[PDB]
Amino acid sequence: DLCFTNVYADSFVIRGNEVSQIAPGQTGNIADYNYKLPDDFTGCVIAWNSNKLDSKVGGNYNYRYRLFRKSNLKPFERDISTEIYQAGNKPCNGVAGVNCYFPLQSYGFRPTYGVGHQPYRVVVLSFELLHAPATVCGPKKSTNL
């Protein structure tokens, strides 16, 4: 019966290790450097083991993760970019070298991973209540005649 204005859907896959990090205001790489779920929020996150469809023996390089960042991404902040990351002194002119690693890294999946390393399809549904009329409503049956 609660009808809201807007809804946003995000979908991806991560490792089964970090499942506990998905919560409003957590400490960890995923909780800050990809998305931070706000401490107050309407909506939530659903995750389920999409291992056998998204894990390859040779390494499912199709699924990749943006890894490095100097800052924590705020709630409803989107950072999608393609830049090589500098850690020690220099970004090593866009190669693989001494202490110079690339954030957009493929996971290197293996279905031979244990239960902890079983990747999860992770989706977040986000509610937005704006001054506009709430049109994304739920059905109004109506009863019989």
Epitope: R15, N17, G28, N72, G88, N89, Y101, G116, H117
Partner: single-chain antibody, 245 residues
Amino acid sequence: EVQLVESGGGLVQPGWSLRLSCVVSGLKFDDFAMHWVRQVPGKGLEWVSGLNWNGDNVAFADSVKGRFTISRDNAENSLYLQMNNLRPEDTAFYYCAKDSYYDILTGYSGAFDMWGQGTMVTVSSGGGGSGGGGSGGGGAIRMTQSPATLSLSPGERATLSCRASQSVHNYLAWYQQKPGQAPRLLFYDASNRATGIPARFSASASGTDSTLTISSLEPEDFAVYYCQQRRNGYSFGQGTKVEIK
């Protein structure tokens, strides 16, 4: 090279507050996380705490949670620890460790790539204290080393196997500690060679099993070797003390 100088140790009466410092030098410290680790005299390593390069990642030991404060400054390249309500079990040898960042989803990795000299803090002048709460952090199934203790002569090959209770993927660290001397890093990720490592030192790992081979032993290569894990609130292994037979 990175020089890590620690200060603040000595003998103190328990119960008051103390400050420990680790000053960093050698390169851009702002991009690297700093960490405290503990040494109980005559036994294995225990982790203390860790602070990220930006300070976003805060990690405290369960025993010291809620009473000890960490801080850092990337302009002067320093890490500070402020401790209160001291008890005699806190007497130890502390080490500050620089960041050795890794690349998987769970976050950055702080380990022993750049060492501090380690400083002794002895809060033992009054009566001893302890508690009856063991919890489950010390009873966890330790990564089994086969053999647990290996005493071999120079010249032959030594094999040490670290078998882990839970799946640690590829993140296991192989470490060397010279008795009375600054400990030395051996193997990143337990599977690839560290830079400048001679051919006689080799290691491999996948899942829960790791093998370390040291061919053609030398009289100076007897030390304490560690296989170390990093799942959540990372702890150290029991260590293997390889000395002369």
